[PDB]
């Protein structure tokens, strides 16, 4: 067996919430979440929530993880798709996901470039490792049912594991999306903090945070560059800039239907007609990054 | 602000004054892209081709990182203020090698690996100075003595003269295989010549000596096998037969051929169509197979 390190091997997993939620586009749905868990200490390092299963959540949650913690020397990514249980998450959404169109690229290809070795099973034969996911469901994504779904605040929207659950009945009962997200962030934070962890590392004494704080300090990581991060963002189809240095984006799809116009001095006087926008849905209402049709970074266009 | 070996690399293209009979028979003047370590002045890699295209950059870059690793703070310079690198930074038609290639963009590849590109010759914000040297002998231009002016290429040497059609050189043209061989030797001689009168060398050491000395200090990371394959050219999907083998109609700027590759793993998988990542140079030996969606499958050898 090869020595394992904090951040050295992370396991990806999804989770369907047993809580009805009124999403940003008025739809009442059962939110789906993708987590990135540190295999060695079990701490949850990042996640992204959306109306359904889609690569964007994997892509952007990966970005949060590497941005916050850095890239280890021997980085290992696991997305156990044995039965094909990840086939839904790995399918690209329809370009009009947010009304405005996106460029068909592939995050899987981006992870490899960054230095991540991908695995589509539960073991890492080459290292002799094999428990990507923990034994006790409590330490895996299933353990998050008690901190989020069961959370008091979500008591009215909770549905339980009823496969055939009528959204129609939950119209007036749905919890506010912004509230759910807040609850989610707190749920996760508590999972990572609970003491009395029945694991080997913790030895029924420490919390996942305790062992991660300890082990992570022994690790050597590099922090991604400015560009490495932006490339992990989504590429919007070239929008034609006007002479005044502004452009519009009809934000629809799964997001709050809006019509944002971004402006940035440089854009104007600079010799540019069309620009390629690189964004993150969660910041779309605030900032976006502009690039020429050839790829050169033009500027950081703010909203108006 | 002390610069380290491998920290700042400068790329520059060179147009040869020697007529060569390429693999596709065409007698042309070969273009080459060089990567040079700004600190020590040592040439780290190059790629030769019929014209000027982004492929040579993408592949020469892969050779450099595969050999020396990726340092912590990596800077890459391609001065295009005078319009110089204009043609190099353009791709060829997808049928440049006969079969079709996907329209990727290597510029985006360099960034995802941690490189910081600059389109000028000075690295803004650091007291390093400029990429291109003063004494032109220490640059790409000093390769004329060791390559173009090589005795072995005397018949095809056109010397400096923009106006010079293949005309006289229909049969005077030196064969590609010999050129490339002479190229590799020239570059190695450039790097080995001692008494280099630079600050670093002090009219005593050679570019090689100083690089060995300085590079020993640089902390780098070797790229993974996947990072390396992702730098290779993406071919359009082909139909893998049930026998676990497929065809690649090589041509265009390369000698025509109908190569057949094979690998058992292809039968065991339910793969009908496979994506091929190749290196023009290794097409006659190996190719890398990837699932239509992006999952590595295996290395198919050439039959």
Tell me the DSSP string of chain B: ----TTTEEEEEEEE-SB-EE-TTS-EE--EEEEEEETTT--EEEEEEESS--HHHHHHHHHHHHHHH-EESSEEEE---SSSGGGTTTS---TTTBBB-B----HHHHHHHTTEEEESSSB-TTSTT-BSS-SSGGGSGGGHIIIIIT-GGGTTTB--S-S---SGGGGTTPEEHHHHHHHHHHHHHHHHH-----STTTTTTS-HHHHHHHHHTT--EEPPPHHHHHTTSEEBPPEE--TTSEEEEEE-TTS--EEEEEE-THHHHS--SEEEEEE-GGGTTTEEEEE-TTS-EEEEEEE-
Contacts of B18 (CB under 8 A, 6+ apart): B29, B30, B147, B148, B153, B156, B157, B158, B174, B179
Phi, psi angle pair for A168, to nearest 5°: -50, -45
The order of strands in the sheet holding A175-176 is: A28-29, A21-22, A175-176
Which resolution, in Å, applies to this structure?
2.8
Q: Which two tokens stand for residue A69?
A: 């913690």
The C-alpha atoms of residue A224 and residue A111 are separated, in whole angstroms, by 12
Q: CATH assignment of B235-302, given 3.40.630.30, 2.30.30.130, 1.10.3720.10, 3.30.470.10?
A: 2.30.30.130
Residues from chain A that touch B234, judged by Cβ atoms under 8 A, are none
Output the CA–CA distances (angstroms, integers) from residue A62 to A48, A80, B27, B230, B239, in the order listed: 9, 16, 50, 19, 33
List strand residue ranges (DSSP E) for chain A, in order: 9-16, 21-22, 28-29, 32-38, 44-50, 71-72, 76-78, 117-119, 175-176, 221-222, 234-235, 239-240, 246-251, 258-263, 274-279, 287-291, 297-303
Query: Exposed (0-12), middle (13-18) or buried (19+): which is A265, by Cβ within 10 Å?
Result: exposed
How far from the centroid of its chain's Cα atoms is residue A87's Cα? 17
The C-alpha atoms of residue B252 and residue B98 are separated, in whole angstroms, by 5
The C-alpha atoms of residue B254 and residue B251 are separated, in whole angstroms, by 5
The C-alpha atoms of residue B253 and residue A232 are separated, in whole angstroms, by 35
Query: Exposed (0-12), middle (13-18) or buried (19+): which is B103, by Cβ within 10 Å?
Result: exposed
Residues from chain B that touch A231, judged by Cβ atoms under 8 A, are 108, 111-112
The C-alpha atoms of residue B108 and residue B118 are separated, in whole angstroms, by 13
Give the up-direction half-sphere exposure of residue B297: CA atoms within 13 A in the CB hemisphere. Answer: 28
Contact A253, A98 (CB under 8 A): yes
Contacts of A133 (CB under 8 A, 6+ apart): A11, A13, A80, A122, A140
Q: Tell me the three state secondary structure of residue A211.
A: helix
Residues from chain A that touch B111, judged by Cβ atoms under 8 A, are 225, 227-228, 231
Q: Which of B150, B198, B156, B197 shows the shortest CA–CA distance to B174?
A: B156
Which of A113, A224, A228 is the closest to B227 by Cβ? A113
Give the up-direction half-sphere exposure of residue A225: CA atoms within 13 A in the CB hemisphere. Answer: 17
Q: CATH assignment of A1-231, given 3.20.20.70, 3.20.20.10, 1.20.1730.10, 3.30.420.10?
A: 3.30.420.10
Q: CATH assignment of B1-230, given 1.10.357.10, 3.40.630.40, 3.30.420.10, 3.40.120.10?
A: 3.30.420.10
The region, left, alpha or beta by phi > 0 then psi within -120 to 50, assigned to residue A129 is beta
Contact A95, A229 (CB under 8 A): no
Which of A109, A117, A225 is the closest to B224 by Cβ? A117
- Where do we find the tokens 């800039």? A241
List strand residue ranges (DSSP E) for A90-158, in order: 117-119
CB contact under 8 A, B294 and A109: yes
| Furthest-apart CA atoms within chain A: distance in Å | 64
The C-alpha atoms of residue A86 and residue A108 are separated, in whole angstroms, by 13
To 5 degrees, how large is the angle CA B28–CA B29–CA B31? Answer: 125
Q: Which of B285, B288, B256, B279 shows the shortest CA–CA distance to B49?
A: B279
**Cβ-based contacts under 8 A for chains A and B:** 52
Phi, psi angle pair for A176, to nearest 5°: -65, 130
CA distance B112 to chain A (A): 5
Contact A234, A63 (CB under 8 A): no
Q: Which two tokens stand for residue B33?
A: 């892209």
Q: Residues B41-80, buried b or exposed e (16+ Cβ, 10 A)?
A: bbbbbbbbbbbbbbbbbbbbbbbbbeebbbbeebbbbbbe
CB contact under 8 A, B230 and A113: yes
Residue of A113, A223, A225 to mutate when probing chain B, most B C-beta within 10 A: A113
**DSSP 8-state assignment for residue A93:** P
Which of B89, B112, B294 is the closest to A231 by Cβ? B112
Annotated binding-site members of B for Mg(2+):
12, 79, 135
Which of A106, A114, A222 is the closest to B294 by Cβ? A106
Q: Is the C-alpha dihedral spanning A105, A111, A113, A114 positive or negative? A: positive
Reported as type and span, the H/E element at residue A266 is: helix A265-269
The C-alpha atoms of residue B56 and residue B75 are separated, in whole angstroms, by 19
Phi, psi angle pair for B159, to nearest 5°: 75, 180
Residues from chain A that touch B57, judged by Cβ atoms under 8 A, are none
Q: Which two tokens stand for residue B253?
A: 């700027």
CB contact under 8 A, A225 and B72: no
Q: Which of A242, A247, A243, A256 shows the shortest CA–CA distance to A289?
A: A247
CA dihedral (B187, B192, B197, B201) in degrees, to 10, reads 120
Q: Which of B37, B7, B9, B70 shows the shortest CA–CA distance to B208?
A: B37
The structure was resolved experimentally with X-ray
CB contact under 8 A, B111 and A224: no
- Where do we find the tokens 């025509």? B256
- Where do we find the tokens 């006790």? A136
- Where do we find the tokens 């609850």? A183
Q: Given the DSSP bridges, would you call strands A9-16 and A21-22 parallel, antiparallel or unpaired?
A: unpaired
Output the CA–CA distances (angstroms, integers) from residue A207 to A41, A165, A188, in the order listed: 9, 35, 13
Q: CATH assignment of A236-303, given 3.40.190.10, 2.40.50.100, 2.30.30.130, 1.10.3720.10?
A: 2.30.30.130
Contacts of A165 (CB under 8 A, 6+ apart): A20, A30, A159
Give the up-direction half-sphere exposure of residue B89: CA atoms within 13 A in the CB hemisphere. Answer: 15
CA dihedral (B53, B57, B59, B60) in degrees, to 10, reads 130
Residue-range domain boundaries for chain A: 1-231, 236-303
Q: Given the DSSP bridges, would you call strands B20-21 and B174-175 parallel, antiparallel or unpaired?
A: parallel
The C-alpha atoms of residue A80 and residue A132 are separated, in whole angstroms, by 8
Q: Residues A272-304, buried b or exposed e (16+ Cβ, 10 A)?
A: beebbbbbbbeebeeebbbbbeeeeebbebeee
Contact A208, A6 (CB under 8 A): no
To 5 degrees, how large is the angle CA B177–CA B180–CA B181? Answer: 85
The C-alpha atoms of residue B219 and residue A77 are separated, in whole angstroms, by 24
**DSSP 8-state assignment for residue A113:** H
């Amino acid at each position: 067996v090869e020595h394992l390190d904090a951040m050295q091997w992370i396991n990806g997993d999804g989770y369907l919430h047993n809580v009805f939620v009124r999403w940003f586009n008025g739809d009442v749905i059962r939110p789906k979440t993708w987590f990135w868990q540190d295999v060695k200490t079990r701490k949850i390092l990042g996640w992204r929530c959306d109306v359904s299963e889609n690569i964007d959540s994997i892509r952007l949650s990966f970005m949060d993880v590497v941005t916050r913690y850095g890239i280890p020397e021997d980085f290992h990514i696991t997305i156990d798709n044995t039965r094909g249980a990840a086939n839904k998450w790995l399918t690209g959404g329809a370009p009009n996901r947010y009304r405005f169109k996106v460029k068909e690229d592939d995050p899987k290809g981006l992870f490899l470039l960054m230095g991540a070795k991908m695995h589509w099973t539960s073991v890492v034969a080459g290292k002799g490792w094999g428990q990507a996911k923990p034994v006790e469901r409590a330490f895996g994504v299933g353990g998050l049912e008690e901190y989020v779904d069961k959370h008091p605040a979500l008591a009215g929207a909770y549905t339980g594991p009823n496969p055939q659950a009528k959204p129609d009945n939950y119209g007036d009962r749905a919890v506010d999306a912004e509230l759910f997200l807040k609850t989610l962030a707190e749920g996760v934070a508590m999972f990572n903090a609970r003491t009395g962890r029945e694991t080997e590392m913790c030895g029924g004494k420490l919390s996942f945070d305790d062992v991660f704080e300890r082990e992570y300090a022994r690790t050597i990581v590099r922090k991604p560059t400015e560009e490495q991060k932006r490339m992990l963002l989504l590429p919007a189809e070239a929008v034609n800039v006007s002479r005044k240095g502004e452009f519009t984006l009809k934000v629809g799809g799964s997001l709050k239907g809006a019509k944002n116009v971004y402006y940035n001095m440089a854009l104007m006087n600079a010799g540019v007609k069309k620009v390629v926008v690189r964004f993150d849905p969660q910041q779309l209402h605030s900032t976006v990054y502009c690039y020429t049709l050839d790829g050169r970074f033009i500027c950081e266009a703010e909203c108006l």
